[PDB]
Each structure stands twice: as structure tokens, then as C-alpha cells.
Design a protein around this nucleic acid. Structure first.
Ligand code: ZN
Lengths: 56, 65
RNA sequence: AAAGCUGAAACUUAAAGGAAUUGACGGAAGGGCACCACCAGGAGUGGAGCCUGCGGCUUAAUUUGACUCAACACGGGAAACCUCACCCGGCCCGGACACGGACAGGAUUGACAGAUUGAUAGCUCUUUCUCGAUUCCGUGGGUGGUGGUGCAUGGCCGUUCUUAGUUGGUGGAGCGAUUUGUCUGGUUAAUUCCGAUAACGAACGAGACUCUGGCAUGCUAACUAGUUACGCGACCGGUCGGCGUAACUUCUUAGAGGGACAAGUGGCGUUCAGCCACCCGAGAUUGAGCAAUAACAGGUCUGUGAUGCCCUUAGAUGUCCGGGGCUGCACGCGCGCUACACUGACUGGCUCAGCGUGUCCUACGCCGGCAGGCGCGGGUAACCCGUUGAACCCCAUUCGUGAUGGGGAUCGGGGAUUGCAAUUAUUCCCCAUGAACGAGGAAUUCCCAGUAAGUGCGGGUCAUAAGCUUGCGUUGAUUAAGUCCCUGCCCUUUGUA
């Protein structure tokens, strides 16, 4: 939670339009889960995605 | 398994083997008991073997009857 | 009389139950939607032979994952060896590093011959030679895996789900889960807009966007693209993909920029969003790619040096080498290919592509009936193959309703190309053999215009190589412009144990 939020706060401080940080796997217990964290604006479809959002 | 066991070949340990190569007399006749290997690199450095009915060199794999 | 009134216990149990909220579901209702739905049809498939992929029965092993849409020509899975996991048999360490022992008075390495073995494997036995602290023996500790678990996981991927869905902030309503915003009604392919309005401001999806088709006798250009003209030549003013110069860009390549917006006209529409028709036009809906929120105990540990646990780890589940198997057939299913002929076969003649690939693609000459054999050239490619002389189709010939010159399965001989190796026949060619099949029962798939279907060609696999898929042209239709009846989908009302 703290680590991912630290990264969000820094990315939004740096001056991005919006951020999406996702962490997936054995977060707690023996069952695989996923935690998505979103802020600002984020586009998913069309050509603009190619040259407006960068992913890792 | 059907076979009892397959054992690896262990080299028969011989003590001080190079004393069998020379036969030095009291006044000093240094005679080579085993024959010399007549090949190029072996010449004067390798003493070719003497089996029961043949000769053999361990380096160059040269054989004579 | 049927029965009425009054009326316990032993034992047994963690809930039974009441209101209201979200979902899901209904053989409940109201709107709308889709050829993985029907209607009208087209081609079919299901019947036949054969190819492949699955179950079974065999086997030494027939390695194995996947089982409605969301398994079964799927794992890019066309397996002769390799691949290769599986079965039989045999070499190798490629067991780092540390500690102890061993040890130049030699730890250890490799091997001729004969036996041994499938093997010219010093693998092992007999017999000796040969290398020089690199090893070899014990414990700890590693390192490998197409070993196990996808129900421990990451990543991609498929599906729910191709429909229009989805969520905060602040304000409002409820003790509360929660709800409103996200809507009565019109309108759209669309939670798309108009307009209502306890909501107002927003965000994602949709749209926009990117690639591709269709138009430019306007623009910039061109011996790796062509035309027009002229000269020379060949043969009768004409034919030339016969050759050489000059104007250019119509044809060819492809950069920039134009062009289409319900814009113009007439109806219909709370004259609003918009809908139908028509003129002018190349075009008045081209085809894709990308695709939210929230989930499948969906598939994959056999893509990985992506990976946690566990199992083995030197007579190994490591790795390699010889074989065999993956294809083994009383049977049942799933994609398909060729057919059942006369709108057709056969023989000859004529005449047109497009995508895209070549360090293996191939022109030209010679020999062989053919598969192919030799010799000598071009091309790392708008340069050579190549003007990619493709097939259906078109025009002649023969056949004649006969299981027939339809169909070419199954079988016998030969002759070539790959490859170290072709038998359980890898492909390829020639002669011979000539099965079922006369349009397929219940059932069931796909599809709306350059579409369906017929028909070839290129790419991927590829030493050998397409009955597969992924693309490209070519010839080119019938029927519909609708509906919720079947099968499902979205929104709104209700009902629920
Ligand atoms: Zn020698």
C-alpha cells in the first residue's frame, strides 16, 4: 500500500495527466489477489494510447 | 534391475614404475629394458611398451608385432 | 357420529423467523437488439472413399495438455534420426565451492591388440603403456531438468460480453446495506444526443483516432516505371515487349495538399435531436486495428536464465548415443478434401492477375517419355526469375445416360530426388488394378455485394513438404431491407422460501 502510494504521489507531483499502478500475486495469504491504484486521467483505446501513455 | 551392478574400472596401483625401464650395472651401463618409440615427438622422451606378443605406445597409439 | 373444548412431557437443535436492500433467476410484463438467432433463400455438413485431430481396444511404449459455446487441422503439433517428453539397452559429469584423507617414492588422464558389445563405446576383462595437483575418495553444499502442482504464482491469452456498459468528489434522501446523479418521453449503431431535472461539476468506455479501399488529365518528381513523337530496321498506310534519342508524367511508383459535412432541395418529426426521398457527385452505411469497470478457482510451470514450494540428483527424472514408439485397429465422434457427371469428362487451340518471397529464387543451352540429370549466366533484388504468358472461363474435337471415356480408393511391378539413413512404403514420375459413391434419415453450420460459392497463386511449417491455416487476386449470384416465433443479449417495472 505505502510503496505503491509513494510512487503515485511522486508521479502526480512530477506533473503527469494521470497514473495507474497495478500489483498482482500473493499479496496476503496463499490465494493470488490484485490491487489496482488509479489517479488523474487514463485512456485505454485508439491510436493516442500508443504515444500519450507509457507502460512498464 | 536384472544386472547385479556395473562397477567402474579402477587403475591397478603400481609402486615406482620407472625403475623397470632402466637396468644400471655397477660400473655404469644404462641399458633401456623397453624399446624406444620411433615416432617424431616421442623420440628419446617415450619408452614404447612390450606386451606378451606385441609392442604399444600410449601417446601416439603405434603398434608392432 | 364426525369431532369440539381444556392440554403435557421425554427427547432434539443454533438457529427458525420479520422488514427492507443489492444481485441472479421467472414457462411474469413493457421498450429495443444479433445471420456465432430466426424469416426469405444460397452453399452446404450429417450418408460415400480418403487426409487429419480426438475418445476407446491393443501394446514394451502407443509421452502428453485441452472436453458445450469457452476441447477435438488446437499447443503455430505436416513427429523417419534430432525433435522427445514415452519403452528396451548402453557411455558421460558438464557433482561449483569448503573441510578431512590421499599424494611427484605419482592424486589421476587416455588408449594399440585380443576377448566383450548392436557399436572401431579402454564401457568392462587380460596385458602393459601414457598424462601430470587440472583430479580421485568421504561428508556439508550445489547444479541440472518437456519431473509434480495452473486449485501456490507472474506474465501474456481466451471468455463472461460485441452488447453499451462503468466510477469518484461535493450536495440531497434513508438508523442502515444502499440510492440519486446514471432519467418520464422522443431520438441514435451507441448512457448518442435533445430536453426534463435534488442535483451540479467531472472521469473511462462509445465517438474521436490510426492503417487500408474508392476520386485528382491540379502540385513535386523518375535509364531500377512507362507513354507520345521522331530516326533506323524486319515483314506485308498497318504489326513489332524489334533497337537508339527529344516533350512530358495520362498509364506506374508515393510524398504533400485537396475532397463528404446529412452540406443543397422536398416531405416527416412536441418544426429540437434527428429520420426517409432526391439532385450534384468517385463516394451519401468500405474493411480493419485499438478497446472500459468487475470476474472466471478458464488454458498455459511442455516458450523462457518468469517463478515459490515438493520430487529426483551419478546403476539420475541431468545429459548423450544406438534402436523402437508417437502412425499401433472388432468400433463412436469433430474440422475437412475429392466426388456422384452431359451447365459434364477427354484431346487440341486461344487469352487475362494480385499479395508477396528469394545467399536459395531461378533465366538460357544440351540429354532423357516423365520425375529429373549436366553446363554456363543474372539477382542481397521496381534492376534477375518476370511483361510473374496461373486456373476456372472462352473456342474446336471425341464421348452418349451405360458404376460409362463419370469417381480414383485399394493393390503389383518398375524409374528418379532429398538425406548419414526411406522398411511400417518421406515426397515425385510411368504402366497396370478400377472399390464405395446415382445428391445422403433424425439432425445441424456459415453467410447480405465485389458478399456466398466456384477457381487457382504466394506466405508459414519446409533437407524432403500441404488434403492445414494465413493472405492475395480471378469469375461472380439467388433472397432480404424485416421480426422477437426459436436461441441468446441490453435497459425498465414487478415476484422470490
Ligand atoms: Zn609414440
Amino acid at each position: 500500500r505505502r510503496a505503491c502510494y509513494g510512487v503515485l504521489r511522486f508521479i502526480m507531483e512530477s506533473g503527469a495527466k494521470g497514473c495507474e499502478v497495478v500489483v498482482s500475486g500473493k499479496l496476503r495469504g496463499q490465494r493470488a489477489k490484485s490491487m489496482k491504484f488509479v489517479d488523474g486521467l487514463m485512456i485505454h483505446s485508439g491510436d493516442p494510447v500508443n504515444y500519450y501513455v507509457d507502460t512498464a | 534391475y536384472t544386472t547385479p551392478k556395473k562397477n567402474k574400472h579402477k587403475r591397478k596401483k603400481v609402486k615406482l614404475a620407472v625403475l623397470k625401464y632402466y637396468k644400471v650395472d655397477e660400473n655404469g651401463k644404462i641399458s633401456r629394458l623397453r624399446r624406444e618409440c620411433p615416432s617424431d615427438e616421442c623420440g628419446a622422451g617415450v619408452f614404447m611398451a612390450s606386451h606378451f606378443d606385441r609392442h604399444y605406445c600410449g601417446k601416439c597409439c603405434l603398434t608392432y608385432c
